[PDB]
Amino acid sequence: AKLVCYFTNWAQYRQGEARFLPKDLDPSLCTHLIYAFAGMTNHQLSTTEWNDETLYQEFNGLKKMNPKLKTLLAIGGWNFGTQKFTDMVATANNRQTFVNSAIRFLRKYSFDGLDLDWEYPGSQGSPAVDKERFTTLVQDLANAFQQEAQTSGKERLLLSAAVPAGQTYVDAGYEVDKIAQNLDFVNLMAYDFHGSWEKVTGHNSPLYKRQEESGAAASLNVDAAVQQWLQKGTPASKLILGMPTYGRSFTLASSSDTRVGAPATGSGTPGPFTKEGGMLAYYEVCSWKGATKQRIQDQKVPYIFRDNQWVGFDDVESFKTKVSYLKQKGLGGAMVWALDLDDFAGFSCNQGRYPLIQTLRQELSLQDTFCQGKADGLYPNPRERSSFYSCAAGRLFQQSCPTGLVFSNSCKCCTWNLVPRGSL
């Protein structure tokens, strides 16, 4: 299982106890750490913060304490917008300039791969052609990453992508089946489903639909987003379920109507640290005094309200529920946005350091010719213990075992690993 955690390079600017600094990084907490963000200049990869180069060394320096730990560098995000992606992907030459710069940059700074965070191909200013050109970008990077690994001798650079949960964005920019074959893993942004852009209270990251929802709204939830990415061609083993360590906040029309779906007049009051109306870090919500917390029964996530302020957020219970679901669906693990929004310093929630992300950590720990002319049956994955190959009429399929089970040829099944006999 993977635990993919995002680092943000502007969290160093928050005040007081919310300030996230190099010491706050825990190299043992996640399996993959991703640096948000890099930007782009003249179609080449570039820093976005005056001290990025210093931060890169601290960041990848984490691998000396944990050398299982892999690191990636993310490009794009909210602030980046789209136009630079659009200009880079348009011509095969511009794409080339980027891909080469990318490889140079990542080796130069000790990153193990690249995470694409374009928001989004085919949306906002991005033209319809950017959908297929994004496929081409992903292909090119996968190509050039593969050849660098032969030539250089070292391990191939990883390639991942952070992908939207909304069908409108997915349809407009993502050829799912294609890109999924090239991406090492797929970071599903299963949050921002509801927020203060809408006129009524809604949860940021609900697990299931509410009984009363219909139309498009019925798919604005984690389960529908997961099935969407599965049905459209993503292997479960590559689908990483994003979790948010922030909630989204509303100002209610009336303090007497606090239901999910209650009229809201706009964003909730900015948090003392994040200072962005409409959202709150977990550390800003977890210890609200004199508030009333409730759980949404159908959606398995909590909300909290106090006077005219209402916030939907994720807690320890909901992260556990989401990991159960995740494993029940055979997903490749969990992704989290973001490290600096969890109570990383244990100063607020009285739950220790990283209570949300630790919850994920704990709960996560509980060819094309090969199958011919084989008979129908199961075969092991020579490169992997918890995966296997099924042959069906000459055709190969790759499946994974349930979490905490291994493939044994003796039962042609996934089962328990062999038991020790009073060993060291």
Residue numbers in the entry: 22 to 387, 416 to 473
What do the study's own words say?
Chitinases [EC 3.2.1.14] are glycoside hydrolases (GH) that catalyze the hydrolytic degradation of chitin. Chitotriosidase-1 (CHIT1) and acidic mammalian chitinase (AMCase) are the only active human chitinases. They are composed of a GH18 catalytic domain linked by a hinge to a CBM14 ChBD. CHIT1 is involved in the innate immune response against chitin-containing pathogens and is also produced by macrophages and neutrophils.
Four disconnected domains appear in the AU: two differently oriented catalytic domains (Ala22-Leu386) and two ChBDs (Asn417-Asn466), corresponding to two CHIT1-FL monomers. The hinge region, consisting of 31 residues is a Proline-rich region (9 Proline residues among 31) linking the catalytic domain to the ChBD, could not be modeled due to a lack of interpretable electron density. The observation of remarkably high B-factors for ChBDCHIT1 (from 26 Å2 to ~80 Å2) in comparison to the B-factors for CHIT1-CAT domain (~30 Å2) reinforces the idea of the high ChBD mobility mediated by the flexible hinge. The structure of the catalytic domain, which adopts the conserved (α/β)8 TIM barrel fold found in all GH18 family, is essentially the same as the already described CHIT1-CAT. The structure of ChBDCHIT1 reveals an elongated conformation (dimensions 60 x 17 x 14 Å), which is different from the globular and compact conformation of ChBDs from bacteria and plants belonging to CBM5/12 and CBM18 respectively. The ChBDCHIT1 fold consists of a distorted β-sandwich composed of two β-sheets containing three N-terminal anti-parallel β-strands (β1, β2, β3; residues 427–428, 436–440, 445–449) and two C-terminal anti-parallel β-strands (β4, β5; 455–457, 460–464). Moreover, ChBDCHIT1 contains 6 cysteine residues forming three disulfide bonds, as confirmed by our electron density map. Taken together, we propose that Trp465 plays a key role in the binding of the ChBDCHIT1 to the chitinous crystalline surface probably assisted by the presence of other aromatic residues in the core of ChBDCHIT1 that increase the overall hydrophobic character of this domain thus increasing the affinity for the crystalline chitin. One face is mostly neutral with a negatively charged spot spanning two residues (Ser439, Asp425), while the second face is highly positively charged mainly due to the presence of four basic residues (Arg444, Arg434, Lys423 and Lys461).
